[PDB]
Amino acid sequence: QTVGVIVRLERETFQVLNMYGKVVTVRHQAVTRKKDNRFAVALDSEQNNIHVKDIVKVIDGPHSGREGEIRHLFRSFAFLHCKKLVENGGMFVCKTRHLVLANELIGQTVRISQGPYKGYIGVVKDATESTARVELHSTCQTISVDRQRLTTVGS
Amino acid sequence: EEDASQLIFPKEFETAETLLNSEVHMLLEHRKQQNESAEDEQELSEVFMKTLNYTARFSRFKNRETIASVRSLLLQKKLHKFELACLANLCPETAEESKALIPSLEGRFEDEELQQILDDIQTKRS
Amino acid sequence: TDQDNEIRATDLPERFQLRSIPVKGAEDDELEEEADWIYRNAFATPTISLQESCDYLDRRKGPSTIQKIKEALGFMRNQHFEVPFIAFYRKEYVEPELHINDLWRVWQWDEKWTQLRIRKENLTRLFEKMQAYQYEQISADPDKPLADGIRALDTTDMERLKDVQSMDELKDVYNHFLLYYGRDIPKMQNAAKASRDMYTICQSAGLDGLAKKFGLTPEQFGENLRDSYQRHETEQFPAEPLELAKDYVCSQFPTPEAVLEGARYMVALQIAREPLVRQVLRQTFQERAKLNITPTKKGRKDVDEAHYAYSFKYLKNKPVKELRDDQFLKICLAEDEGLLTTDISIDLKGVEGYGNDQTYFEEIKQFYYRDEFSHQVQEWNRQRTMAIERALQQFLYVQMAKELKNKLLAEAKEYVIKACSRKLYNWLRVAPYRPDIRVLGIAFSSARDHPVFCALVNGEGEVTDFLRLPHFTKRRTAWREEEREKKAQDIETLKKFLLNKKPHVVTVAGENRDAQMLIEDVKRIVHELDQGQQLSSIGVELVDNELAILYMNSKKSEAEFRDYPPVLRQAVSLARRIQDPLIEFAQVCSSDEDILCLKFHPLQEHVVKEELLNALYCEFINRVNEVGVDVNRAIAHPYSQALIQYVCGLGPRKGTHLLKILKQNNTRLESRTQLVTMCHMGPKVFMNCAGFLKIDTASLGDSTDSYIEVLDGSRVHPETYEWARKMAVDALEYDNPAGALEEILENPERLKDLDLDAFAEELERQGYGDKHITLYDIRAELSCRYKDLRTAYRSPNTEEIFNMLTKETPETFYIGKLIICNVTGIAHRGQAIGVKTRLDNGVTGFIPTKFLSDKVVKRPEERVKVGMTVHCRIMKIDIEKFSADLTCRTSDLMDRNNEWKLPKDTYYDFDAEAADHKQEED
Amino acid sequence: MFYHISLEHEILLHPRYFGPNLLNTVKQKLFTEVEGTCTGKYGFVIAVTTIDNIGAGVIQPGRGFVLYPVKYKAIVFRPFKGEVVDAVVTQVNKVGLFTEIGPMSCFISRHSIPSEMEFDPNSNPPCYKTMDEDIVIQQDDEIRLKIVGTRVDKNDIFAIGSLMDDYLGLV
Structure with a gap:
C-alpha cells in the first residue's frame, strides 16, 4: 500500500520517506527495491498533463510556496526533489492534485489489394495504428502503405 | 580558525563592515514593507520571517536616531568592528560581564573607560 | 539492563514502578488535600470551550466524589493498588461516582498534585532563604529604614505562596518575587554559601520611590480590581508629577518627562506582576475573552470551500466559550500553516457604538483614580492612566491571551484524544463471534488480476489449510465465456473446500465494493450447500481489513508464516480478529507503536503522542482485565501472550518473566497459588493480578496431580475464596466446602435463594466493611464463571459497510461537496435519463440531463463521452446502494448564492471577507 | 554574527x-x-x-x-567558535537545551551547562535549575551562549553553543 524513497543512508538504519510524507525507520533487509515508473500519468488542479521531472509549485497542501522536481510518481502522490531543503535530505512528498503547473499485424504476410502497389506481397516489419511498413519480396525495398490497402494472406 | 579569541578573519570580513541587531531589524522590516507594497511577488522566505521576528524581539535600539547615536559613540572609540558590534548588540550590563563575554576585550581598554562606555550604551537604550 | 530485573523483583505494580514520579505513601491530611484538589481541578472545573462529556462507561458529580477520590488515592499511594484492581475489586470504595476511567483521571491528577507539591516546596525553600538573606541587612543596621527598593518579603508573601492552587498562580507568585528580589539572588547565593532588563535602570535611578507616590500599592490596586470599586482611595500628593520628577532627574533620566516615563514603567510593571491583579485579570479573560481570525495573503486564496479552515476563515467577536470539540485545534493548525492570524481580546473589535462598549481598561480606570478637578490631581490622574494603560496592554493582555489560547488548544487536544479512546474502546469491546470456532478469512486485492486467498483457522486460531482462487474476482455473469468458466471453476473449488473443511464462519475483507460481490458469491455457494443439506449453515460476515493490513505489514506475520503471501496473511488476521478481536488487536499492536498506525482521529497527529498512547493503553488494560487472560492458553498459543502485559499489575516485564519461568519449568499454571509458590511472585503483585488471571481447570484435567481449585477459573479473588465456599454452603443449606462448591456450580439455581444482605451484615460485624457488591459479584461468578461482558458481535450495518468499502465518512462525503467523476456509460430506460459515472471510491454517480449543463441539453452523447472526467456537486447520497446524484452545471459549480457550500461559523466576518475580495478585485 | x-x-x-x-x-x-x-x-x-x-x-x-x-x-x-550571542529558547527537554539565533539553530548539552543546573523531568515544562533555583531557563527565554562548534549541513550551517562561562544565562 505504501511506497517511499530513501532520503538518508546510514550504517544500520534507513530513513525512507513514504507517500504520506512522514519519516519511518527500517532496516536494510526489510526494505526491498521497487522499480521507478519511467512513464506514468497523473492529475493536477489545473487539469493539464503533468509528467516526471517537471518543475511545479506547491501552492496548497502540506508544503507552501515550495518548488521541486518530480522524481517518482504515484496515482495520488508525487515525490519532489530539491537541493536547498535541509529537511528530509531535500526530498519531500506532495499530492498530485495539489501539485500545479509551474501490433497483431506485425510479422504477417500481406497482399496490397488497392493502390499503385496492387498485387504486391510483403512482410509487415512495423505497423502503426493507421499505416504499415511492408518489405516487398520482389523489389528489395520496404514501403509505407495505408493499412486500409492491405489484406493478410491466409494459408 | 576564525573567532573572537584570535580575531583572525578572512579578507572578505576585513574589507566589509558589521551590522547590529537593531539596524539589521530595521533594514529587514523595511524590505518586508517593500515586498508587501510590491504586488504579485514571490512569497518571502520563512527563514527571513524567523530572523525578522528574532531581531525585532532582540532590538535594543528602537529608533534610527538612537542607532546612529550609538554607532557614532562606538566609532569614537578605537575598537574593531567585530568587538563594537558584539558589545552593542549584547549590551553588557557591567564591565566584568563584558570582559567575560568578550575575551579579547580585557587587556585592550581599561576598566573605568569600559564601564563609562557601557553605561552610555545603557542610557542610549530606551 | 538491571532496571528490568529490579522491576521484576520489586513487589509493586509494574506501571506503578515505571511511573516517572515514584509512588509514595500519603498521610491522611495529604490525602484529603489531594482529593479535594483533584475533585476541584478535574471534575468540578468546566472547560472554557464547549466540550461534551466523553464518559461512556455510564450505562457530573458533586462533593460526594471527594471521598471516593480520597479512597482511590489511598488505594494507589498506600496500598499500591492499580486502577483496574480498584475498579474491579474495590468498587464499594470508589463507585458509583468513580469508574475505572475516572480512577485513571484521579491517578493522573494525583501525579499533577505531587509535582505541584514539589514545586511549592522548592519555592518555599527559596522564599525562606530570601527572607533570611534580606533580614541579614536589617540585622546589621536595624536603625536604618529599608530602602524603597528593598521590599519586605513578609509572611503575607509566604502565605500567598502557600495559597497557590495552580501552576499559573505559582508562576504569578514567582514572577512577583523575581521582580523585586531577582537582582539580589546572586548575592543571596554567595552569602548562603559563605555562611554555610529595563527594570533595573529605574531601580538604580531611584524611580521606585517616585513609583510609590502615585497613590496605591500594587496589592491595593489588585484588591480594587478584585472588588470592582475604589476599595483603597488613591493618596494625592501636593507636588505635581513633574515637580516630583525634577527631584529624581539625573543623568539616566534627564528630562522630567523621562523621569515620569520611567516611574510610569515601574508602576505598570509592578501592577502587571501583582499576583492578585494577575488572578483577577485571568478570571476576567476567562469570562469575556473573544477570538478574532483574519486570513493572510496565503489563506485568502488557499482557504477554499473544501479547506477545513473555511468555516472559521473569518471570525469576529467569537467568545472562546463558543469553540467546540477541536475547532480551536483546527484554527491553531491553520495559523501554524500561515492561512490566518488569531487574536484573543476582552474588548469588541469594530463594534463601535454598541451599548457598554467601554473596554476593561476604561472600566477599571476609576479603580486607580482621584475624583478632583485640581490641576495636580489631573496630572497625577493622567500619570496613573498611562501607567495602567501600559501595564495592561504591554503585559497583562498579551500574557493572559497567550494563556487562554494554550488552555483552549489543550482542551481541543484532550477532546481529540478522548475521541481516539472512544474509537479504541468500541473496537476492543466486540465479543468473539458466536455462530447461530472455525473461521475462513478471505482476502483480495483491488487489482483484477490479483487472486483471492482463503485461510482456514480452527478454534484456537491456528492456520490449518489455505485455498488460492486465481479468478475469484471475476464476475460469474461476465459476458465473456472464458471469464465465466474461470469463475465457475473457482466456484466449484471453493464449494468443495467448504464442503470438506466445514468452516463455522467466513469473513471477507472489505477492500472495496468488490467485497460485496465476493460476499454474494460465497453466500450463494453456502446457499447451495444448505439447499442440498450437505452442510450446515455457515455464517457470512464482512470484516474491515485495516487490522488485517497492519498484521500483513508487521514483520511478525512474516516470521510466523514466511511462505504465506500477504493476502493470505491478512486473511488469517481477519479470521483471527473475528474469532477474538481483543487478542488480535493486542497481538497486532506491538511495543513498536504500531497502534498509532491505526486511524483513530483525523487530527490524532496534532495531539500529544504520550497522552494518546496512554489513553489507548488504558483502554487495552481495562478490556484485558475485564475479559481476563488465560496463562495456559497463552503458553500453548504464543500469539495470545500479548494480553499478559496488559494484565493488571504485571506489565510486559513481569508477564514475560512469568512465561519464562513457566516454560523453563515445562509446567502449566495449574492454580493461582503457583504464582507465588513456584513463580515467586510478590504479595502485592499477586493481589493485583490474581483476580484477573484465569486457569482452565477443566482443561487441566486429571493430569494435574496437585490439588485443583475450581474457583481459580473465576473472577472470585483468592481472598474471597472462603466467602465463595460459604456462599455455596448456604445455597445448598448444609447442616464439605469442596462438595458444596462443586454442586452449586453444577446447579447454581439455588443461589437466588441466598440472602446475601444478611451475610453482608455478618461480614461488617466481624470487620470486613461493606461487601454487598462483592457478594453479588461472587454469586454472579458462581452462576457463570468468567462470563464474557463484551458486546455480542453483530454484522456491520449499512452505514458501516459504506464507510468500510468506500472509505468515506459524512464529514468528507456530504451534499454540496465538489467531486470528480469519470463517465462509465449513459443511463438508459434511444431514450436516456442521464449519465452514469464511477467514482474513485466505488460510488456510482448519476448526472441527470437537466443538470448536465446550464442550458438545455438535446443529446448527452456530445456533452460527455465514456472515460471523460467531469467536476460535479453532490445532490443526494445513497450509501445503501453506493450511489450519488451529481450535477455539473457551471452555475452550480460557481454557487453564487452559496447554497451548496458548507455552513460557515456563526461569528463569520462576512464584512471582512467582502472587503478583502473587493480590494483583491480592485 | x-x-x-x-x-x-x-x-x-x-x-x-x-x-x-x-x-x-x-x-x-x-x-x-x-x-x-x-x-x-x-x-x-x-x-x-x-x-x-x-x-x-x-x-x-x-x-x-x-x-x-x-x-x-x-x-x-x-x-x-567562541563568541557569546543572544539566543531564544525554543524547546526544553532532558537531553539538552535548544535555542535560536536568527536562522542558526544552536543547542546546549549537559556538559556545557554548569554543574549547578540540573535536569527536572518532573517539571511539566522541562527546565534547567539549581538547588537555589535562582535562574530557571524555560522555553522562549533569552540566554547568552558562547558558540563552541559549527558544521555545514547540506549547504546549511548549524552551530552548537554553550554557556559554561561565568554569567552566561538569563538576564
Whole structure:
C-alpha cells in the first residue's frame, strides 16, 4: 500500500520517506527495491498533463510556496526533489492534485489489394495504428502503405 | 580558525563592515514593507520571517536616531568592528560581564573607560 | 539492563514502578488535600470551550466524589493498588461516582498534585532563604529604614505562596518575587554559601520611590480590581508629577518627562506582576475573552470551500466559550500553516457604538483614580492612566491571551484524544463471534488480476489449510465465456473446500465494493450447500481489513508464516480478529507503536503522542482485565501472550518473566497459588493480578496431580475464596466446602435463594466493611464463571459497510461537496435519463440531463463521452446502494448564492471577507 | 554574527526574458537565488541590501543563455567558535537545551551547562535549575551562549553553543 524513497543512508538504519510524507525507520533487509515508473500519468488542479521531472509549485497542501522536481510518481502522490531543503535530505512528498503547473499485424504476410502497389506481397516489419511498413519480396525495398490497402494472406 | 579569541578573519570580513541587531531589524522590516507594497511577488522566505521576528524581539535600539547615536559613540572609540558590534548588540550590563563575554576585550581598554562606555550604551537604550 | 530485573523483583505494580514520579505513601491530611484538589481541578472545573462529556462507561458529580477520590488515592499511594484492581475489586470504595476511567483521571491528577507539591516546596525553600538573606541587612543596621527598593518579603508573601492552587498562580507568585528580589539572588547565593532588563535602570535611578507616590500599592490596586470599586482611595500628593520628577532627574533620566516615563514603567510593571491583579485579570479573560481570525495573503486564496479552515476563515467577536470539540485545534493548525492570524481580546473589535462598549481598561480606570478637578490631581490622574494603560496592554493582555489560547488548544487536544479512546474502546469491546470456532478469512486485492486467498483457522486460531482462487474476482455473469468458466471453476473449488473443511464462519475483507460481490458469491455457494443439506449453515460476515493490513505489514506475520503471501496473511488476521478481536488487536499492536498506525482521529497527529498512547493503553488494560487472560492458553498459543502485559499489575516485564519461568519449568499454571509458590511472585503483585488471571481447570484435567481449585477459573479473588465456599454452603443449606462448591456450580439455581444482605451484615460485624457488591459479584461468578461482558458481535450495518468499502465518512462525503467523476456509460430506460459515472471510491454517480449543463441539453452523447472526467456537486447520497446524484452545471459549480457550500461559523466576518475580495478585485 | 558584505554572483538568463524589463528580471532572479542561501564561506544570507552593478552580459557560445555577473551588497550571518550571542529558547527537554539565533539553530548539552543546573523531568515544562533555583531557563527565554562548534549541513550551517562561562544565562 505504501511506497517511499530513501532520503538518508546510514550504517544500520534507513530513513525512507513514504507517500504520506512522514519519516519511518527500517532496516536494510526489510526494505526491498521497487522499480521507478519511467512513464506514468497523473492529475493536477489545473487539469493539464503533468509528467516526471517537471518543475511545479506547491501552492496548497502540506508544503507552501515550495518548488521541486518530480522524481517518482504515484496515482495520488508525487515525490519532489530539491537541493536547498535541509529537511528530509531535500526530498519531500506532495499530492498530485495539489501539485500545479509551474501490433497483431506485425510479422504477417500481406497482399496490397488497392493502390499503385496492387498485387504486391510483403512482410509487415512495423505497423502503426493507421499505416504499415511492408518489405516487398520482389523489389528489395520496404514501403509505407495505408493499412486500409492491405489484406493478410491466409494459408 | 576564525573567532573572537584570535580575531583572525578572512579578507572578505576585513574589507566589509558589521551590522547590529537593531539596524539589521530595521533594514529587514523595511524590505518586508517593500515586498508587501510590491504586488504579485514571490512569497518571502520563512527563514527571513524567523530572523525578522528574532531581531525585532532582540532590538535594543528602537529608533534610527538612537542607532546612529550609538554607532557614532562606538566609532569614537578605537575598537574593531567585530568587538563594537558584539558589545552593542549584547549590551553588557557591567564591565566584568563584558570582559567575560568578550575575551579579547580585557587587556585592550581599561576598566573605568569600559564601564563609562557601557553605561552610555545603557542610557542610549530606551 | 538491571532496571528490568529490579522491576521484576520489586513487589509493586509494574506501571506503578515505571511511573516517572515514584509512588509514595500519603498521610491522611495529604490525602484529603489531594482529593479535594483533584475533585476541584478535574471534575468540578468546566472547560472554557464547549466540550461534551466523553464518559461512556455510564450505562457530573458533586462533593460526594471527594471521598471516593480520597479512597482511590489511598488505594494507589498506600496500598499500591492499580486502577483496574480498584475498579474491579474495590468498587464499594470508589463507585458509583468513580469508574475505572475516572480512577485513571484521579491517578493522573494525583501525579499533577505531587509535582505541584514539589514545586511549592522548592519555592518555599527559596522564599525562606530570601527572607533570611534580606533580614541579614536589617540585622546589621536595624536603625536604618529599608530602602524603597528593598521590599519586605513578609509572611503575607509566604502565605500567598502557600495559597497557590495552580501552576499559573505559582508562576504569578514567582514572577512577583523575581521582580523585586531577582537582582539580589546572586548575592543571596554567595552569602548562603559563605555562611554555610529595563527594570533595573529605574531601580538604580531611584524611580521606585517616585513609583510609590502615585497613590496605591500594587496589592491595593489588585484588591480594587478584585472588588470592582475604589476599595483603597488613591493618596494625592501636593507636588505635581513633574515637580516630583525634577527631584529624581539625573543623568539616566534627564528630562522630567523621562523621569515620569520611567516611574510610569515601574508602576505598570509592578501592577502587571501583582499576583492578585494577575488572578483577577485571568478570571476576567476567562469570562469575556473573544477570538478574532483574519486570513493572510496565503489563506485568502488557499482557504477554499473544501479547506477545513473555511468555516472559521473569518471570525469576529467569537467568545472562546463558543469553540467546540477541536475547532480551536483546527484554527491553531491553520495559523501554524500561515492561512490566518488569531487574536484573543476582552474588548469588541469594530463594534463601535454598541451599548457598554467601554473596554476593561476604561472600566477599571476609576479603580486607580482621584475624583478632583485640581490641576495636580489631573496630572497625577493622567500619570496613573498611562501607567495602567501600559501595564495592561504591554503585559497583562498579551500574557493572559497567550494563556487562554494554550488552555483552549489543550482542551481541543484532550477532546481529540478522548475521541481516539472512544474509537479504541468500541473496537476492543466486540465479543468473539458466536455462530447461530472455525473461521475462513478471505482476502483480495483491488487489482483484477490479483487472486483471492482463503485461510482456514480452527478454534484456537491456528492456520490449518489455505485455498488460492486465481479468478475469484471475476464476475460469474461476465459476458465473456472464458471469464465465466474461470469463475465457475473457482466456484466449484471453493464449494468443495467448504464442503470438506466445514468452516463455522467466513469473513471477507472489505477492500472495496468488490467485497460485496465476493460476499454474494460465497453466500450463494453456502446457499447451495444448505439447499442440498450437505452442510450446515455457515455464517457470512464482512470484516474491515485495516487490522488485517497492519498484521500483513508487521514483520511478525512474516516470521510466523514466511511462505504465506500477504493476502493470505491478512486473511488469517481477519479470521483471527473475528474469532477474538481483543487478542488480535493486542497481538497486532506491538511495543513498536504500531497502534498509532491505526486511524483513530483525523487530527490524532496534532495531539500529544504520550497522552494518546496512554489513553489507548488504558483502554487495552481495562478490556484485558475485564475479559481476563488465560496463562495456559497463552503458553500453548504464543500469539495470545500479548494480553499478559496488559494484565493488571504485571506489565510486559513481569508477564514475560512469568512465561519464562513457566516454560523453563515445562509446567502449566495449574492454580493461582503457583504464582507465588513456584513463580515467586510478590504479595502485592499477586493481589493485583490474581483476580484477573484465569486457569482452565477443566482443561487441566486429571493430569494435574496437585490439588485443583475450581474457583481459580473465576473472577472470585483468592481472598474471597472462603466467602465463595460459604456462599455455596448456604445455597445448598448444609447442616464439605469442596462438595458444596462443586454442586452449586453444577446447579447454581439455588443461589437466588441466598440472602446475601444478611451475610453482608455478618461480614461488617466481624470487620470486613461493606461487601454487598462483592457478594453479588461472587454469586454472579458462581452462576457463570468468567462470563464474557463484551458486546455480542453483530454484522456491520449499512452505514458501516459504506464507510468500510468506500472509505468515506459524512464529514468528507456530504451534499454540496465538489467531486470528480469519470463517465462509465449513459443511463438508459434511444431514450436516456442521464449519465452514469464511477467514482474513485466505488460510488456510482448519476448526472441527470437537466443538470448536465446550464442550458438545455438535446443529446448527452456530445456533452460527455465514456472515460471523460467531469467536476460535479453532490445532490443526494445513497450509501445503501453506493450511489450519488451529481450535477455539473457551471452555475452550480460557481454557487453564487452559496447554497451548496458548507455552513460557515456563526461569528463569520462576512464584512471582512467582502472587503478583502473587493480590494483583491480592485 | 550579523554582517554586511558586497558579494558577486553570476546568473544565467534564458533569452525568453530578453525584453524591455531585462534588468528588472535580472535583479528579481538574483533575489530569488541568493536570498536565503547558506554557504560555508559567507555563513547564512539574511537579505540583499542593493545591487552594486550589472556587469555586461556575455552570450555563451552554443547556448543563448546570457551570463550576467552581478555585484550586490547583502546581509549575512556567519557565526564563529567562541563568541557569546543572544539566543531564544525554543524547546526544553532532558537531553539538552535548544535555542535560536536568527536562522542558526544552536543547542546546549549537559556538559556545557554548569554543574549547578540540573535536569527536572518532573517539571511539566522541562527546565534547567539549581538547588537555589535562582535562574530557571524555560522555553522562549533569552540566554547568552558562547558558540563552541559549527558544521555545514547540506549547504546549511548549524552551530552548537554553550554557556559554561561565568554569567552566561538569563538576564
